[PDB]
Every structure is written in C-alpha cells, then in structure tokens.
Design a protein around this ligand. Sequence first.
Ligand SMILES: CC(=O)N[C@H]1[C@H]([C@H](O)[C@H](O)CO)OC(C(=O)O)=C[C@@H]1O
Ligand SMILES: O=S(=O)(O)[C@]1(CNC2CCCCC2)C[C@@H](O)[C@@H](O)C1
Length: 660
Amino acid sequence: LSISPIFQGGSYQLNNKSIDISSLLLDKLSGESQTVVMKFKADKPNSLQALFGLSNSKAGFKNNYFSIFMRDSGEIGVEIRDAQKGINYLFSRPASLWGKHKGQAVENTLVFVSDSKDKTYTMYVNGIEVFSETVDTFLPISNINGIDKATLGAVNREGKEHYLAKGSIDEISLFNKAISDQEVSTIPLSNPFQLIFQSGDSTQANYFRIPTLYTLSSGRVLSSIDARYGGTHDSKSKINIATSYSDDNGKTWSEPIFAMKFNDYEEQLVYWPRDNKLKNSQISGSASFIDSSIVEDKKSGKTILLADVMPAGIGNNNANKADSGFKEINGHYYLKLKKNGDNDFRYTVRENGVVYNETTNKPTNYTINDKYEVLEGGKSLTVEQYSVDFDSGSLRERHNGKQVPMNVFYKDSLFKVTPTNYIAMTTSQNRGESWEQFKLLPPFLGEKHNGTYLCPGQGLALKSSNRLIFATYTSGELTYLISDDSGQTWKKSSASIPFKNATAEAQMVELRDGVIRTFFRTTTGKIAYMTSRDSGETWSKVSYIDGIQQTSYGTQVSAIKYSQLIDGKEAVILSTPNSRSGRKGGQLVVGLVNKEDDSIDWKYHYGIDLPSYGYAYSAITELPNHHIGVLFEKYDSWSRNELHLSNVVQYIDLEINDLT
Ligand SMILES: CC(=O)N[C@H]1[C@H]([C@H](O)[C@H](O)CO)OC(C(=O)O)=C[C@@H]1O
Ligand SMILES: O=S(=O)(O)[C@]1(CNC2CCCCC2)C[C@@H](O)[C@@H](O)C1
C-alpha cells in the first residue's frame, strides 16, 4: 500500500469473549478517513456477531458505536451510529462470506473503506465489492462522540459485551486513509473459489444466474450462464446467454462471449436497487434468453447449446400457455407474425424466411433472415434501442438514439412473434470460440400449447451412439427432446410425472449403455428420479431419494456419472442444496451403483460450505484430470432478501478424496 498501517495485529482467537485493543489503537486514529483490512475465519459463527467494534462504552451512550458485523447467513455489514449527531447508518449485503472449504475454515479477506472526501463507505470481501454507499452527512468512524473502546469480537455497550463472536482474526490492519480501489486490488487474497463470469467483464451484466459446465472431448471445459442485466430477476428482463471455456482443467477461463444475444436494449452494468420499494423493478420491454443447456455431438464434433427465448416483455408468468406461436400447415410448422396495426396474427414465416400473408396466401415483400431480423425488399429494417436508468427515482426504459437490426422478438418490430416462450439452439464449430445464429426448435406438444422449458445444465450424449437428448419440462411431464442427426431434427419422448405445474428441472446420467437415470426437482421436498433402458424411448415410473432434503418449492439438481470407480463401484455424483428451510447447505452427494438392480447407495455427503450459507442452482463436471469442477450460485436465489447480488456465482475445484 501507499501508506503503512497505524495499527497491525494478528492471531486473535475470538471464543465468545472480546479482546480489548483500545490502548493499542485509539490514540492512533486521526483524521476523518479510515481503512480496515481484516483476515478472519468463522466456520461456526454465532447468529449475529461483531468482528470489530469502536464504541462509547459509557452509560447513556449505547447507540454511539461503529461495528463490522456478520450473520450466520453469510451476511456482512457495518453499523455507524452517534445519538448526538442523530445518525444511524446500517449498510450490509447478504451472502458475502465463506465459512469452510474442503473441511477447513476459510480465511476471508475483508476491506472496509470509510472515505470522508467522497462521503462514501465501501466494503470488499474476498476481492469482491459487496457495497458502496454515499451519504449526505458523513460520519467518520472514530469521530463518534465519546469513543473509549476498540474491541475485537464484540461491541462494548454500557460496559457489556454485545454481539459476541466465535471465530478468529488472523490479521487486522487499520490506516488513516481511504485507500483507492486500485490499491485494494493489490491486497493478497486467500480465496477458495474463482470467478468465471463477473461484474465488469465482457458481458457488462452486473448479475449472473443458472450456471452450466460441460467437459468436451478435446479436454476443453465449457461453461454457459444467464448474463442478467435487470438484477437477478427471471424473464421478463434483459438476459443474454454467455459462455467461457478453460483449456487447463479450470485453472483459467476465457473472457466471456455471447452464445445468444438480443440488442433491442443496451447491455448496461446497472446497480439494481435492493430496497423494499424498488427491488421488484423489472425490465419490462426487452426480449431475453433464459436457462441454457450444453451438449457435445460425437458425430459432427459440434457443440450444441439450447436456451429458452422470450419475446419482449415476456417471461414464464405471462407467456401464453395456449399458443405454441407456430401455425401447422400440412405436417409442417411455421412461425406466426403479427404486423403493426393488426389485431390478429395474419402472417407466417415460410421456407427461406419468406413472410407470407395468411389472409390472402400471397407472399409479401418481407423476409426474415438467419438472425430473425426483418428485411424489406432485401434491405435491413431497424428499430431504436432502449436503455434503462433509475435517475428519476424509479425504473425508466427509454429510446437512446441508437439504431439496431429490427428483430421479430422486439417490442418495436413491424412484425412480432406470439407472446409466448420458445426454445432455440445454436451451435459452435470451434468448441465455444464463436456461436452461430440461433434457430427456434419446432413445437412438440401441438399448435395450441406453449413450448416446454429447458432444464438448465447439460444435455446428454449417449456413449454407444450418436443420440443427443435434452430434458425439458412442462405441466404434468418431462418432455425429452431427442436428436439422432446432430440436432438437425428433434422428436419428443414424454414422461408423465405425478405433480401438476411443477418446475421439474431434470438432469440425466447414463448408468450403463442405453440406461439413463434422470434426477429432477419436485414440489415434495424430495429429489425424484426415473429410468430409461432404451436410450430414452420409454421411461419408468417416478421414485424419490430419501437422505437429501429440499424445500417445498425445490432447487435445480445437477448430476454426473463419474468415469472412475469409487470403493470398487460405479459412481454418480449429485449437487444440490440439502435443506428444508431455504437454498443453503450445499452438498455433493456420492452414490455407488448396485449392478444387480441399478439402485444407488448414497454413501458420501460432502458439505460445500456451512449448512446456513447459500447454495442454489449448480453445475458439476468431471474435469479431464478427474477432479470435479463446481460452478454454483453461492446465495439463496429464492429468498426475496438476497436479490441482485454481484459475483455470487462461483467456481471451485474438488478431488474425490475431498468428497469421501
Ligand atoms: C424460465 C424461467 O423462468 N426459469 C426460472 C425458474 C422458473 O421461474 C420456475 O417456474 C420457478 O422456479 O425459476 C428459477 C428459480 O430460481 O427457481 C430459475 C429459472 O431461471
Ligand atoms: O461422458 S460424457 O457424457 O461425454 C461427459 C464427459 N466425460 C469425460 C470422461 C473423461 C474425463 C472427463 C469427463 C460427461 C458429462 O458430464 C459431460 O461433461 C460430458
């Protein structure tokens, strides 16, 4: 750093008894700007505990203190309080911490900058900015009226220990300066994780959800994700699908590119509001992609990626359930279009993108190209792009002066698709270095049924054939999409399930040649499964796994077949929260296959981090060196308290010995 600390100490054990460092620190504090750098572990935290306190300990001044505190939910924050000044600041962010990794307490690196010149308080944990708050009336942390105690592991209020901590502070430094963002980035870290996608990267999305991982035949490992712009909200929103790969067993990852992108709205990095008045603000006029899945095709060598596609302002809540968006004429399916001013859909898209008029069966002078863009007489039509802002105190979506190709999925398009959900595919011929323009899959359940929903994660490539399968769900069933010709044509295999309107997110493993077990989310608090023994043509009844708990609403479960024997048996690995309370208590569960009947003995449970720390959607893959890569949402993506968090989708590397 550009300056030396005014105080430095270390190896403090916090065992429900605070340590007083007043004599060491208080007379060193000077000026109105301070930086606290603290390396600390808390693998068995109390419900709510202070790591560091500056306080007025005298009778009558219980509300005059500064503290850095944490919760056993993983939340970190500060309080800055002075009764005389009439100031009570509370800043925090959920899901900011690690507890344990590979059975070992994680050294978290916390940097808090209190900057009087910019009147801004900024918190970083593990190299990640979790909050930055500017105020009209700045309160320097050591200018609190009557401060007489500096405390580790509690806050001294009126002579008593409040917020008693269990943990350790291995290193703490304080500086009479607000160190710059640049200098913060030089502070050495001890992180157990890495980021593949992150705020400020090439996607310019401040948020990410729905990770995938897939190990390709070359040894490259590929990842996809929802790059979500309008906070962490599902569609309707602006969301693109981004990808990144690793050629060195997950050690380093490429700068992300888009596999599927719309441009009716600008790609903006926005700090979405988290207060109770505005947090449900939602980009409402943008088209989007959501929930991707990846597979590799042995035949063509192509990588194939599917995702749901949502027209402008559409998501699963308002998608028309009674319309596929296609017209069936003969045995063929054609995308329907509504033209500006018509109250019905009087057009279809035919072969070679010719826009046809259904009311008179004439072709028009309009065509749809390979990017689903509108051409008139071969000339590209355009629309004006939108940008979003909260400058007026609420969400505004408005034209920004920039023209972009007119797309049938856009709000401002001359021709518009049916307001319902679709599935598209794209392919890469260079293992994720570039992606083709996407194609819509045809409808599978008839003219008047909305599309199914893609199960995020991996598709399945069968070992002994060229069959490709992508699981999807809808009301009352899993609908497996099957291709035997490199994704050129698809057919459905329907498998009834005993829940109506479920989110039956399903992932498959091939237990042995032609035998597929599918594990899926339900509404019962238990993960279910079904088996196919004819490469997906037919499916067994549904069974449930005991020994793992989910919530009533459930969470995606990822699943792989391990290439190596474990305890002499074939192994399957599941990744899921294990909790009936929320999306937390992340585990990998190792199951050994009983060859006699293909039953699975769930023998090992690996705790990814604390039971109380967040874990939601996840991706797992066997890396080429036989380690396991896990990319997962490290927060509760269901909780309405943990919306719009940045850099919570994280990646770790595990070995089987860590799991057993
Ligand atoms: C297409 C879509 O909306 N998919 C979303 C899915 C869906 O909303 C479901 O109906 C309710 O779980 O929910 C979740 C979720 O965190 O639970 C993530 C998906 O991105
Ligand atoms: O067996 S595959 O289905 O082709 C696959 C990869 N197998 C290799 C075997 C050799 C070690 C690394 C993983 C498993 C799925 O989880 C995908 O990652 C693709």
